[PDB]
Amino acid sequence: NSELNTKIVNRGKEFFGSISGEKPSLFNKGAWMGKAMDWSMQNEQFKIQMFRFVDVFPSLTTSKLLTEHIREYFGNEQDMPAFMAVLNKVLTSNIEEMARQFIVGETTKEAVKNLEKLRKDGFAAVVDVLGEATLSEEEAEVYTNTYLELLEALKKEQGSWKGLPGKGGDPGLDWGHAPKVNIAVKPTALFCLANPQDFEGSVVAILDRMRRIFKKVMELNGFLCIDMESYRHKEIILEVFRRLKLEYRDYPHLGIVLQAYLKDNDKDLDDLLAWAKEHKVQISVRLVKGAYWDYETVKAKQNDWEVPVWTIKAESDAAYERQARKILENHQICHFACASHNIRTISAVMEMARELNVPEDRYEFQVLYGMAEPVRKGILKVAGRIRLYAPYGNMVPGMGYLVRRLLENTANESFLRQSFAEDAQIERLLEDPAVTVERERAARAAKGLGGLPPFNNEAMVDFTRADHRAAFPKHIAQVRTQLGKTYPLFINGKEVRTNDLIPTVNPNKPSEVLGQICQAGTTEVGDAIAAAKAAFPAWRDTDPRTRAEYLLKAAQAARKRLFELSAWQVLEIGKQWDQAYADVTEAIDFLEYYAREMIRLGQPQRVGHAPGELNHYFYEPKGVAAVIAPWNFPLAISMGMASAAIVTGNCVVFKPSGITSIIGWHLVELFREAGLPEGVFNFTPGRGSVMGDYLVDHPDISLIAFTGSMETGLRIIERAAKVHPGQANVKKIISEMGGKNAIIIDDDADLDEAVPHVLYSAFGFQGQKCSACSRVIVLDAVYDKFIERLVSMAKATKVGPSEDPANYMGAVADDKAMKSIKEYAEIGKREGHVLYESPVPAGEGYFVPMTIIGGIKPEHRIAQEEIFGPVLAVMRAKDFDQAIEWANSTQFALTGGIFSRSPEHLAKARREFRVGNLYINRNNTGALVERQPFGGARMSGVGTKAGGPDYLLHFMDPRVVTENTMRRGFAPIEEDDDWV
Amino acid sequence: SMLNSELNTKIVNRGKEFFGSIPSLFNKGAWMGKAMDWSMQNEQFKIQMFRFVDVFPSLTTSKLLTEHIREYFGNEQDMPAFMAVLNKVLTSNIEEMARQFIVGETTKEAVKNLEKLRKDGFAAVVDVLGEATLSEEEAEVYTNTYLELLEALKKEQGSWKGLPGKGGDPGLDWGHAPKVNIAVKPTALFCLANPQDFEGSVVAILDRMRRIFKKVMELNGFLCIDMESYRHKEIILEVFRRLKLEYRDYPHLGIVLQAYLKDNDKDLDDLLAWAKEHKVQISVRLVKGAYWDYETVKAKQNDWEVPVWTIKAESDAAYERQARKILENHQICHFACASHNIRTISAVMEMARELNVPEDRYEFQVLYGMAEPVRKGILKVAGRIRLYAPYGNMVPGMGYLVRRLLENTANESFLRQSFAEDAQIERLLEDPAVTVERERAARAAKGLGGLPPFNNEAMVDFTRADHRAAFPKHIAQVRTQLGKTYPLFINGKEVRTNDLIPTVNPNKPSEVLGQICQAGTTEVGDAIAAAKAAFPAWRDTDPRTRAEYLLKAAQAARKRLFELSAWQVLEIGKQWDQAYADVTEAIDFLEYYAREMIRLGQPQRVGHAPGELNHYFYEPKGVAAVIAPWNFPLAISMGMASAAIVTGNCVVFKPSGITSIIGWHLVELFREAGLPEGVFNFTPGRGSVMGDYLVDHPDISLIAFTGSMETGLRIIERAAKVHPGQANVKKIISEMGGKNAIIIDDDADLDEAVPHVLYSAFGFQGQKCSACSRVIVLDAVYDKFIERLVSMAKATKVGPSEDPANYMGAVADDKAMKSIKEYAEIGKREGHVLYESPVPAGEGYFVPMTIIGGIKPEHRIAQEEIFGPVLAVMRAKDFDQAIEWANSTQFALTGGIFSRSPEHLAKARREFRVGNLYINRNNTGALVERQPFGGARMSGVGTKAGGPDYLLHFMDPRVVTENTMRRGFAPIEEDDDWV
């Protein structure tokens, strides 16, 4: 509204006038930090080096680590900027100085002394406790107890504090109305397993500790603010606030943070206000724009979720002014904290509040300590009511906080950068951001092949959504109404029953029988092969684009049954909810990706450029493919190998693993729904001891795709190499076998990241993945600290049925797996020393304890042999060279990981840690189609990589047709001829 | 210059006297004019129509005709308005079109039609139509047709008054010219005419030409020696020179020179100087040239310099330039202007006037049936016109028709421009030198990593005197180098052993080329150890650097091309061309795999998610065993070894025993390239001693093998075993046998099918995995195809490969000879022998060139790879059975089909499922990049050497995935999916 807007702009102009050209320290080019940020803002490579250096800085605890990282990040002295061992000293002192700029102290007593100084200068505070990520219950308790310690100290001090001057109200309160003690707590720091996948358990665990802090806050009439973290926990945190508020409906000093950069926030704010009115309670909202913009955008893109934040900066500004107005209009029920360093934003709030004649006791202004100093002083002068967000504590998390402040101040879109570094025009800085949104929305208004959109991975299940959370228990119940069926063979489009039945049961509850599976003898396998062979000529002659269309239809059929198909996997093979869904999305990805790959490869290409001649190079299928599939990714890998064979023009005889035969039947259902011609896909579960060699040895098999154990894979390779009478082809092997995968934890690893990634890599789906981390190789100097945190986190996790989302892992695949794994755990406990062995539920279930064993060395059996269960070996390496040597000390080379922030060590790992899939600074499991084509060599496979652009070629053979186009002295000229 | 402008004005003005004084294909009222018009408007149609006319004379049944009509022109709705009835429509029209260009189908009709033309004031030069000469019987028929014609003409000419002239002998044409004038195609006189055997070709052609010439002289006639494709130009010049000197006083012998050849300025200068030196006179018929598209294509296919000008005006300019040179030399050189181009004719006329040339020193010639108003106008303006008049069988008459239609309707044709186009006369009569400069100026407006794009190495080119002389010289030089002992080469050191095996010349086994040290298991083990020790540093060597060694090796080989070829002539009995092609293929592999590794050597980002980088790249495997064949001893050895090496593996190489010296060439080439020690190790040895040891060794990660199915299958079976300490599952790269068929369809062009089949079967005496060992011939063309194939076979000679007069020679060694002969005997009990050549007496592993018919798919020689000069002929009842029979073996390596049926060609492309299918050419001689080579079934494991998938087989892929987000920030990368 032009009138209000003009008052806002003039208010903003006065503000800029009052500042007198002063710059915040970060933009003071006479200071070292100003120089560092100046160069960071001019040179993106330096910015990345400098900011990553500050991130790793607190782990550089020896002279050697420090000296080496300085050289690795910034180069030799002669090549550093001028503003930049004496060098160790100058860098250390300047970085520590920058971090102290944003922190009120390292101890409670220091924090308190400094806050009282702040009061004497007219500033109120909200205190925050710095901390590393909470990875255990002990860490959650230390964090909780620090707030209690802080509150007990403030309790003794606040009586001696005169209330900050206000225009009215109570002289014992700040500005006449605000409680003198105000603290902010990060909710997920109160529960190390906070996850919307276990929504209720997460709310309760956080609520219980928040309640303890809150009672102490109430005891001294203080204010508690529940801070808002990443989008993943937003709904959990809102529910925590609501419940705590209702437990103390008469206590007014409880706040929640809401983030204006979220598209959800208009609705979330309106819902919260309606909720408060409904319940006749009052609330307090600290509105911020939001702290995790880059993270949310990246995470959403990585999982093919809708980006939850606005992506044009002015949209967040516009959203802020809009939502601030809403809060102010509702000042009767909603107290407001304006949390922004943007003068336009601040000015907007001030003018809107004056216009709505909001009482001053219903709104205050807040800024981050040590930041935008002239804005802070300007707020004091014009508004009077200004509160500093004041973190205190250890320098280790202090450095992480510093990095976030540097990122915030130096961002391209940063109001502070634009005002104080870039000399932006005031009129542009102060313009209505709604106007800004239109102009940039308008400017912004300015690829696949063959009519198909490009490949994108199917969206992962998203438990921030209530509907996704509710879908699993519903679809599991539906599956339970479908139990007890008999599953026949499927050959040449018909069901063939045998009289050899094997039950398939729930590994978490073996008395629960899911169905009975018919077993194929050699007779039926031979029939299936004969059917595939008869179907092959017509299928081979089918246009590749038409073959791809069948995979696309199968993908659509699967997509429509996504939760149903997932639920079957939860019960049949003990997949956790997320593990099951990811198995189904991966199956979908293979279908979408291989369809596209066949379309790409299906067009014959001209080769050579000589005139009078046309050479066309193209591919043809081999014949009948045996597909022998594992139980651990029962839909994904089955569908991957089968659809790859099918789309390339081969016909398939498919043997699922016995214990996941129902999932294998899903391929029958999906390919039938797609209308696949009969005989192209045949489903023949059977006993390996009866028909295993028969299927592999058969003369009409031309290709064998196998995923499973090395022993079986090697046997197949040996038997398949023989050419029997009537055998048309040398048999082609496509094989992925075991791994004994290591993750290296280097001295400078970020343990906040390493610990949960190692735990998930080792124990996700009970460790039953060929990619699972079974060896964690830890550098000497960080060993004790890493292990303490790894074991403490493991202790917080629960083992139990996979249908219950509160359990981290559950039973292993079957009775034989359980016995094999337990034997390996006993072997390991005699080779090394047990560090952790979890409780398991009493009663039925193939439960193996989550097990961590230290003291492991490369000559030990559990350092060498694939266990395929929740048994983690911890190995202590004396130096990085030994770590690499130990990583490479097995006969396998499937996956590997390394957590390190040393460019030199990462480079050595890229070169020498020669696994098929090496992961840097993240878990080594969860490979995605296209992004991480999966497979290795050594004893881990034959160098074929599923989900990659070389894969389909392995299912075909190339052919060339060469035509002499010259007749009677003339040949047609072709576009690409070498001519004259 | 100023003089230039004045003469041009006279030429332009003369051009208009021709146009004022002034064909049936451009007449849009006649059916042909309509068919031609649509051909000139729609190129797709032109191609169909011309190819249809080409195949037309093979369409001998109602079924063939009807189906080809449908396949070429679509259904009676698809085809245009000027188009069973259609069968009748096309037949009469096409036959009528062909008759327009020939003066008769018999000698009597021809002679009667020539006499008509005489009374109409036209002289003639008579030519005999014929299919390609493929045998001695055919060359004799062609020869005797000329003698028969001359005998007929001899009785008529005394009755002819000479064409009216300005004076002289009234019994002679125009007072001076012989009434009888004939033209002969020299290569039609010898079915094996080939500059590779230069002297033999000259003599064989010369002997028949002399016989014709004697008869010509007996009636005081004129003999013109026509000029054919560039391949035979030097042969034909030499035939003309020898015959001329044999009858130095007889003035009525002419040669054709082609102005489209860049060589022609010098060839004409040389010929004129030659005539003055020998004090003889000559006659030249200057033409522009009949084989333009062919010469351009052929040159590009063999990486030779294109021998013709490629801007049409350059040929016109050359013609006027060369006609002037002849006319300046009119005292010694009689001139026949042979062009239908009015500018060209007017230029000759005004130059002759400018140089005051007497009329008895030049005449004008045009082809019969063509440029009638030019022949009308030239007769009236120029006065002395001779029609080139072919006569004979309708079959070659149709092929001649195709050429005339091609000439008349070419975009750059002076005739097409003059009429159908309605062009400005100013542009048509323009000095072609001015056109040249403009077009050259217009024309005055790729590789990777600084390297030129790949091109195949130029093939040996025996049109050149230096290439012809190089082989005898280099064979001699190799013979000064015999008698050496060749050691193992391990870890950069020569290692001698006490076990020596001689290598001898298969065409002369008493000639011993050297002694080869054999490696025991201990030496093999040492070489594997050396390779393994060199591997980590080699693996860590930049792909671009590794590729550089291959490029150095390729330059090293390129500098020794003739020397390297000569060793193969002597050590394994390669013919000259076969030997040189073996070395160029080796060079091609080096150049191609170097480029392929550079392309594949860069890690590529995969996926597009932000906060993440995935890089996909390749790693070598380790030690590669390379087990090489003797039949392509440099090419395939170098291909398999350089591929393994460039991809970062280290090689232990076992050459075949009988080509161990060729194996040593790899040692020499890699050493000259400076390859690091241990990366390539040379260990010849006895299979019975060290074969399994090498294959079984646990330090071996890859085996590259080319050879027999039996040995290949054993290797595959043994390598599948993982032994203690074996790091990888062994990768197999294998090319094994073939039992390759060529199908000869009913409508096949037999002039092409016959020599290509003969070459495919007996080139390098059948010792190629790609060789044709089965020719599957359609029922209705069987008897005719076999007669010509057998008759051509009979004309070839078996003997030592160092003598280029021989087609094929001795097989590889004693063992091969015994094995092949056992198969021949087996074959002769299974079928019936059609041909079995003589072979030289005395020493040498000679097996006769052998052709056997009555063969069916159940027969052993229809199934088992013989690897020798034994060709099975199989008679198929229809095309479906031909395809079935072609597919009836356990092999699928190469195959060929001669057919001009779109439907049959489509069926073959789909169903004749070999690794390399060839259409209308031989099925041998695959080239790098153009024909990546290899197959499946029992012929291999689907790896194709010389193609873009091949290097991946020697490596394994790796992916590195990095989470780039720290503390909530990640660098934005170019190809990120972002906002």
Ligand SMILES: Cc1cc2c(cc1C)N(C[C@H](O)[C@H](O)[C@H](O)COP(=O)(O)OP(=O)(O)OC[C@H]1O[C@@H](n3cnc4c(N)ncnc43)[C@H](O)[C@@H]1O)c1[nH]c(=O)[nH]c(=O)c1N2
């Ligand atoms: C007292 C107090 C307490 C807290 C916080 C701040 C203060 C002052 N913060 C941090 C807060 O989110 C952060 O400081 C502000 O977003 C900074 O924005 P300004 O108005 O200062 O600056 P400025 O006006 O320059 O705004 C920058 C903001 O715009 C947004 N943005 C940047 N690029 C964008 C784009 N391309 N598209 C759309 N939006 C874009 C981001 O939110 C970014 O922070 C927070 N944060 C949080 O999430 N939870 C919390 O509990 C707290 N706690």
